[PDB]
Amino acid sequence: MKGNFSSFMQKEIFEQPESVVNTMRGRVNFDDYTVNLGGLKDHIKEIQRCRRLILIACGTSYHAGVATRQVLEELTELPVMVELASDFLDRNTPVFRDDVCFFLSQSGETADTLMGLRYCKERGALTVGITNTVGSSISRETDCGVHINAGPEIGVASTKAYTSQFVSLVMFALMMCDDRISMQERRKEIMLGLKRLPDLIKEVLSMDDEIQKLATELYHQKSVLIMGRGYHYATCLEGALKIKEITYMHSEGILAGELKHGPLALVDKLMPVIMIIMRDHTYAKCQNALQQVVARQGRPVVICDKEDTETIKNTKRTIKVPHSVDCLQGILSVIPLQLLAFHLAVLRGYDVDFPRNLAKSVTVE
Amino acid sequence: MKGNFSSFMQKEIFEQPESVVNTMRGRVNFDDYTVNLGGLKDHIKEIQRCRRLILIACGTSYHAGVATRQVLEELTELPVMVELASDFLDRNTPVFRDDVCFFLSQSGETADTLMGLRYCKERGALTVGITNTVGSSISRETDCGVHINAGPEIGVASTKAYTSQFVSLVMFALMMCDDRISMQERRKEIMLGLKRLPDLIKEVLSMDDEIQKLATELYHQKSVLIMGRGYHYATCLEGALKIKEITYMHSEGILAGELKHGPLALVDKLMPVIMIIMRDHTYAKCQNALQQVVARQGRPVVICDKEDTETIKNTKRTIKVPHSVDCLQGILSVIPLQLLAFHLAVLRGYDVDFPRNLAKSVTVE
Ligand SMILES: O=P(O)(O)OC[C@H]1O[C@H](O)[C@H](O)[C@@H](O)[C@@H]1O
Numbered sequence: 001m002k003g004n005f006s007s008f009m010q011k012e013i014f015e016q017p018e019s020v021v022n023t024m025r026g027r028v029n030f031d032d033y034t035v036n037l038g039g040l041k042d043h044i045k046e047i048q049r050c051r052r053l054i055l056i057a058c059g060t061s062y063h064a065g066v067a068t069r070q071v072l073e074e075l076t077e078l079p080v081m082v083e084l085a086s087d088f089l090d091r092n093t094p095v096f097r098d099d100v101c102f103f104l105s106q107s108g109e110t111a112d113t114l115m116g117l118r119y120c121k122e123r124g125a126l127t128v129g130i131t132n133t134v135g136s137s138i139s140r141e142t143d144c145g146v147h148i149n150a151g152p153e154i155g156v157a158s159t160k161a162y163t164s165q166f167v168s169l170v171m172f173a174l175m176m177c178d179d180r181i182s183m184q185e186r187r188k189e190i191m192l193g194l195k196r197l198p199d200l201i202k203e204v205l206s207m208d209d210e211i212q213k214l215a216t217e218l219y220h221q222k223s224v225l226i227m228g229r230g231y232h233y234a235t236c237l238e239g240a241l242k243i244k245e246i247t248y249m250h251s252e253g254i255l256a257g258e259l260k261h262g263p264l265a266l267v268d269k270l271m272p273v274i275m276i277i278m279r280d281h282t283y284a285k286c287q288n289a290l291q292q293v294v295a296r297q298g299r300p301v302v303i304c305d306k307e308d309t310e311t312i313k314n315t316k317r318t319i320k321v322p323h324s325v326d327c328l329q330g331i332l333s334v335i336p337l338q339l340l341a342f343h344l345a346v347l348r349g350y351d352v353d354f355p356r357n358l359a360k361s362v363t364v365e
Numbered sequence: 366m367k368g369n370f371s372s373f374m375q376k377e378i379f380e381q382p383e384s385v386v387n388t389m390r391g392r393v394n395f396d397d398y399t400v401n402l403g404g405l406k407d408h409i410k411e412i413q414r415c416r417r418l419i420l421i422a423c424g425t426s427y428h429a430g431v432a433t434r435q436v437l438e439e440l441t442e443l444p445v446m447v448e449l450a451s452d453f454l455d456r457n458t459p460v461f462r463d464d465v466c467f468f469l470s471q472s473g474e475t476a477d478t479l480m481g482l483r484y485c486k487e488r489g490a491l492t493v494g495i496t497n498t499v500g501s502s503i504s505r506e507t508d509c510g511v512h513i514n515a516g517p518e519i520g521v522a523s524t525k526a527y528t529s530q531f532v533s534l535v536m537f538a539l540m541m542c543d544d545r546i547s548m549q550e551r552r553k554e555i556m557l558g559l560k561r562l563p564d565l566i567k568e569v570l571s572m573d574d575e576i577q578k579l580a581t582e583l584y585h586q587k588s589v590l591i592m593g594r595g596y597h598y599a600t601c602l603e604g605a606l607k608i609k610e611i612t613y614m615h616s617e618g619i620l621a622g623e624l625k626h627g628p629l630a631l632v633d634k635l636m637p638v639i640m641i642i643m644r645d646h647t648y649a650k651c652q653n654a655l656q657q658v659v660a661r662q663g664r665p666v667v668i669c670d671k672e673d674t675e676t677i678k679n680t681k682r683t684i685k686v687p688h689s690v691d692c693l694q695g696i697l698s699v700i701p702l703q704l705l706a707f708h709l710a711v712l713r714g715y716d717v718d719f720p721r722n723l724a725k726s727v728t729v730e
């Protein structure tokens with residue numbers, strides 16, 4: 001059952017300390033800093049010989065690709081392209097024999113993702129499935145893959161599977177760079193982060209009541225702009241998607257560096273704005289975005305890290321999440337957005353697990 | 366002056382038959398199907414030897430890249446990556462010696478685009494400027510370039526420069542494939558399209574009164590979803606941007622193949638929806654998107670081609686544009702969206718040339 005929770009989605013959000021452990025179970029060894037994804041053991045040397053990584057997906061799975069693009073670029077040193085599967089197909093995207101294509105899919109049955117897989121296979125690319133469903137078409141038809149091991153997810157709006165996909169792609173990245181002397185300190189930083197992550201997720205979930213109060217402030221609103229950049233760009237997209245999915249409010253993710261190029265004309269004292277600002281190398285530029293938003297009379301809610309003394313000092317509405325390594329922080333920063341969507345949906349009387357007009361998996365067309 | 370027009374933006378929209386001719390002037394010869402961009406004459410063989418095209422830009426210039434990605438892929442057979450300049454920089458995107466990087470910029474001074482240029486130059490990439498401003502930093506600092514020759518554009522919301530950038534990148538694509546026997550019929554198709562385009566733009570502008578009537582139907586609305594896919598994905602993004610820029614309504618471009626993955630939960634009888642449906646190879650899939658929207662009680666306005674008998678027959682609100690070749694159709698289909706933004710802004714009492722919170726060029730940070 002959902003037993004102890006009124007919805008599957010809330011259960012699944014609160015399961016994230018355990019789902020992240022489950023994803024890393026048998027794969028990461030924190031004593032000797034090894035990571036092994038057995039499903040990729042054979043094919044790994046081959047992947048390192050490939051020239052480009054292409055991540056192909058729909059919906060929240062696509063966001064997990066956007067969330068891990070930078071660390072994949074960093075640690076593989078390969079170009080990484082992230083593609084919405086329907087557009088990838090419409091464009092007859094060039095794929096080559098020495099491309100490695102990843103198919104990210106909770107269900108493993110999404111029609112566009114599966115047809116993208118078949119397209120790449122026809123062109124001789126090495127294909128890799130990252131799914132949550134053993135025995136699924138995408139799991140069966142790829143050359144190799146990783147079962148993210150998040151466990152069954154029933155909520156139509158995906159929560160634990162997003163963060164389990166995120167962790168899976170980070171573990172892949174860690175395997176890819178494991179022969180480089182120069183990257184050993186970076187790998188150890190990230191792995192110590194992964195070790196700490198479950199406890200930090202518990203700490204985020206403890207602010208559920210604060211998020212519920214923010215949802216009471218927002219639930220009459222018709223729009224909200226969610227702004228972030230760099231590692232947190234995916235966080236804003238996925239948070240915007242979540243609020244669309246189950247609340248039906250018109251939430252839009254805005255790349256923070258593009259704010260000044262159009263979206264800022266929507267900012268005034270009446271447009272709700274959520275800004276994500278983390279202490280990574282984009283920090284000063286995000287502070288600049290915040291300053292612009294405030295200068296145009298917006299009253300943003302800011303998601304920042306607990307140790308970010310200056311924005312806590314100088315900003316009235318902050319949702320304070322624990323600090324982690326730059327490339328893992330989005331796992332923490334998305335959770336208040338998952339919870340915000342949840343609580344907004346509840347305030348509005350809407351079904352959180354089975355929203356209108358949506359399906360857990362779109363297997364047709 | 367703007368003389369005969371009350372705004373620079375309306376003047377600039379109505380100048381598009383002439384700006385497109387100006388862009389192609391001295392470059393396309395319709396008698397012998399040659400295209401020559403002298404600024405690229407020397408460097409062309411070198412570009413053909415490169416391995417990847419990367420288009421880097423902000424705002425509407427970025428949309429022109431999205432609008433031409435597919436035809437560039439098709440005719441160059443090269444991978445093409447399109448990047449928002451601010452994100453490109455934040456990620457420390459891998460660039461290589463045998464990449465060719467294009468910088469699309471009306472002003473040639475946008476800080477993020479210019480810093481992207483400098484980043485690529487440092488990495489030994491061949492750099493190409495596509496700008497509307499002679500003597501600009503991006504024009505001066507690239508290895509070669511094309512002045513799009515649209516003439517001065519004063520409206521902060523870019524209109525003629527979008528369609529002139531679009532045409533410039535198509536002419537580049539035509540140069541790239543000009544030694545291939547197998548592509549000669551395709552090149553001639555596209556060039557006969559470019560020859561016809563100015564007259565077809567006049568025909569679109571003649572429906573200004575119909576668009577003004579649609580703006581009267583929309584101007585109390587707070588949101589609008591603009592949906593398209595394939596070649597028309599850029600058209601929906603740029604139309605959404607235009608409505609944000611000068612009307613301050615919350616318009617969002619939605620990739621039509623992603624509709625079913627979240628945005629469809631926003632559709633009911635009260636959410637305005639504009640769908641773009643063209644008779645290219647995405648047609649049946651767009652009809653499916655339309656059917657879903659109508660099935661969930663939406664009442665969309667559809668932008669379709671005049672000769673699309675079946676959606677004209679079966680859909681009540683259509684904005685009927687002239688038929689062109691698939692890879693040029695977005696030049697026509699964006700124009701009613703430029704005009705819709707214009708007329709909405711006028712109905713709301715807002716300054717169309719100098720909207721709040723925005724600048725013609727963001728040269729700082
Ligand atoms: O992640 P996949 O099974 O390929 O599905 C892609 C998407 O399809 C459906 O729309 C779901 O409601 C989503 O939660 C999901 O992100």
Ligand SMILES: O=P(O)(O)OC[C@H]1O[C@H](O)[C@H](O)[C@@H](O)[C@@H]1O
Nearest residue numbers: 261424425426470471472475523
């Ligand atoms: O096209 P560029 O000069 O690089 O400018 C990028 C953008 O900057 C400004 O925001 C303008 O208002 C836009 O119309 C434009 O698209």
